[PDB]
Amino acid sequence: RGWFDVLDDWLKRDRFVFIGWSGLLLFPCAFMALGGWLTGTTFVTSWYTHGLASSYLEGANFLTVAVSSPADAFGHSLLFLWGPEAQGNLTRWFQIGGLWPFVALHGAFGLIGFMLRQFEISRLVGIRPYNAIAFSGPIAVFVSVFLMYPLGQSSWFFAPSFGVAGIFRFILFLQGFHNWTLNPFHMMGVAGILGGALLCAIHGATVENTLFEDGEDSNTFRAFEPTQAEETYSMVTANRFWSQIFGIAFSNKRWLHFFMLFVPVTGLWMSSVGIVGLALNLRAYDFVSQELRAAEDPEFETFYTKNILLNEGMRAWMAPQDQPHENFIFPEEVLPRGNAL
Amino acid sequence: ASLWEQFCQWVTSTNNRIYVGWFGTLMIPTLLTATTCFIIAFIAAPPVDIDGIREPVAGSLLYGNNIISGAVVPSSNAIGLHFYPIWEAASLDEWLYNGGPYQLVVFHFLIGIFCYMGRQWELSYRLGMRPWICVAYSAPVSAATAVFLIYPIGQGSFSDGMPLGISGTFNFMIVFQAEHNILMHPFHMLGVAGVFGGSLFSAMHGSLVTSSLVRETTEVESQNYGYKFGQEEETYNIVAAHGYFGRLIFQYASFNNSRSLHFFLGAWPVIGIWFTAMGVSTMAFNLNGFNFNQSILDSQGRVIGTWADVLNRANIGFEVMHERNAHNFPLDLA
Amino acid sequence: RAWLATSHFVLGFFFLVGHLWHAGRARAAAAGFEKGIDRETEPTLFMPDLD
Amino acid sequence: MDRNSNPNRQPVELNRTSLYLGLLLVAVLGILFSSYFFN
Amino acid sequence: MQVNNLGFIASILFVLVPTVFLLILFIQTGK
C-alpha cells in the first residue's frame, strides 16, 4: 500500500464531514472567504477606499456592513498582503481594501473546490454528476459579476461589495448606468429564476396533493419509506389535473426533473453573458429609433423614454458620492430634476 | 334528469378536455374579455394621459412602440380610484384617452385569476385529490393583486398600478424603489430568498433526481424514455441521492423522505412570495423599507456615510426625475 | 393609520389563505380523500383519456 | 477503393412535444430579440 | 420610426431557420 493510496483512504473515509481530495482546496479556501467576510463586516472600515463606514465596529448593522471593494486608484491590482501596496502591513492591507480580493479569490477557489467535491462524491457514491453541472450556473454568475465585470471596468472598485446594501448599490448602479433591466440577457435570467421558483412551488404542491393513501394518519409524511419501490404520488392524476387546468402537463417524470434543473441554470448562464457585455459597457441601453423620434417630436413619450430620464437623474445625483475618487463636483443647478421636486 | 341537472353534470364533468367548473363559468368569460382587450389595446390603443396632466403616453405598437416598450397604460391620475367603465365615457375616444382599457383589463384579469384558483380547488375535489395546489397558487395571485389592486388603493389611484408592459414594469419598479426603498424592506428580502432559494431547490432537486436515474435506456436514446407514463416503480434511486447529498453537506441535512422534501419544495417559494406580496401591499400604505440615512455619526456629529446613504442618493436621483411635470408642491405625498 | 391598515391587510390575507386551506381540507375530509389517493380506487384510472 | 456502408449511422428523432417546446422557444426568442434587432 | 434596416430580415431569419430545423426533424421522425 503506497502512501498515495493510504492518503486516499483517509481522505475518503465515511465521517460526519466528508473531506475528499477536493476538501484540500475547498475547506481552507471557503474558511478564508467566510472568515475574511465576517472579519471585514465586523471590524474593517471603507473610510479610505469609499469614505464609508462598513463594519459593526463603526455602528453599521447587518444590512449596511460590507467587505467593500478596494480603492479605484489600484486598478486591477490583486492586492496581496505582501504586494507593493500593503507591503506586508496587515493594518494598511485592511485599510486599502485588501479583504475584497482576499474574499473574492478564496471564494472563487472555494467554489471550484465545492464543484470538485460534487464531482468526487458523485463518483464515489455512483451517480451521475448533474449536481455539479447545475452548480456551474452559480459559478458562471460569480465569475461574471465578481471577476469579469470589474476586470472590464477601470478597477475592482466597481465590483460589487460583499454586503447587503453594497449589493443593492451595485444593483441600482447597474440600472442607472447600464440600463440593465432593458438587457435581453438579464430578461432571460429573470425568466429562468422566476420559472425555477414557479417550478419548485408547483412541483412540490402537485406532489403533496396527489399523494397516495399509504397510511392511516392525517399526517401523510409518515406514509413514505425511502426503500419503497413504488411511486408515492399519482403521476396519472397529476397529469390529468394539469392537462385540464392549464391545457398541458408533464407526462414524463424524468423530463420534469431535468426541466427543473435546466430552467434556473440556463437563466443564470444567460444573465452571466449579459454581465460580460456590461463589463465592456456593451449595454442594451437605448432604442435608437425612439430616441431619434423623441429628439425630433416633443410629444412622443413611452415608458422607455421615462426610464431613460430616471437613469439620467440617478447618475447625476449618485455619482459624486458613489465615486468619491473622481472628485465629481456637480453644482446644484446642473442636477436634473422635475418641477417642484 | 332535469335540464339544470344535465347542465350541472356538464359543467362539473371531469371528462371535458379543459375542466370548466363553477369557478370556470366566471373565469372563462372574464379571462377572455381581459385577453381580447389586452391584445387590442397593446397593438392599437391611442396614447393615455396617465399622470392626468394632459401628457399622454404612447403604449401601443402602432404608435411607435416595440414589444419591449409597449404597454397598456394605467388610467389617468385624474380618475384616481373612480370606476371608469366604457359606459361612463362620453365617447370611446374619451375612454381610451383616459386609460379605460387598463381598468377593463385589470378588473377582468383579477376576477379571472381568483376564479382560476377556485377552479384549481374544484378540479382537485372532482378528481379526489388533496386540495392545496390552489394554496400554492395563492402566492402569485397575492403578488398580482398587490401590484394591480392593493398598491393603487393605498396610493389612491389606478394611475399608480403596474403598467401592462415590459418597460412599464421596469418603470413601476424604479419608482417604487425611489418612493419606498423596497430593496431595504425585509419582506422583499424574503421574496428574494423565496425566488433565489426556489430556483436553487429546483436545480438541486432536478439534478439529484436526474443524477440518480435508474438505467433503463441506452447511450443513444434519450434517458427520458426510461420512464413510462403511469408506472408505479420509482424511476430514480432516492437512497443513492440521499447518500450523495448527505455526503455533500452532512447526513442529517439531507432529506430521505420524498414527501417532506416535496413539501419543502412547495412551501419555500410560496412563503417567500406571500411575504413579498405582503411587503408590496404594506408599502401601499407607505410603511417603507428601513431608513438608515445618517444613522452613523462621528463624535463631533458629522455624518459618516454607509452603503445605505449611497443607495439613498440613487433613490433621490430616481425620485426627482420621475413624473417630471406632475408635482406642484415640495413633498411627494400622493 | 399606517400601522393599523398594514397590519390588518396582512392579517386579512393570511386569513383568506387559512380559509382556503381549511375549506379545501374540510371538503376533502368530508369526501374522504384528505389522506391521499386510494391506490385501489384511484378515480383518474376509471376516467376516459382526455384525447 | 470501395465504398462501404457505414454501420455507425443512427436515426435522429424529435417528438411532437419537443417540436412544440422548440417552436415556442424560437417564437419567444424572436419576440424578445426583434425589438433590439430593430433598435 | 427609423429602425435598423436589417431588423426585419434578421428577425425573420432568427425565427425561420430554427423553425425549419425543428420542422424537418419532427416530420422525418419515424423514418
Binding site: - | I67 | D49 | Y20, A27, G30, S34 | -
Partner: peptide, 30 residues
C-alpha cells in the same frame, strides 16, 4: 413596418400554444 414583425412573432407564439394544447400527444398508460 416593424409592427408587422412584432405582430408576426406574437401570433406565431400564440398559434404554437393553440396547437400544443389542441393537438398534443395524448398521454397514454401502457
Amino acid at each position: 413596418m416593424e409592427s408587422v414583425a412584432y405582430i408576426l412573432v406574437l401570433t406565431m407564439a400564440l398559434a404554437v400554444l393553440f396547437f400544443a394544447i389542441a393537438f398534443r400527444e395524448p398521454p397514454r398508460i401502457e
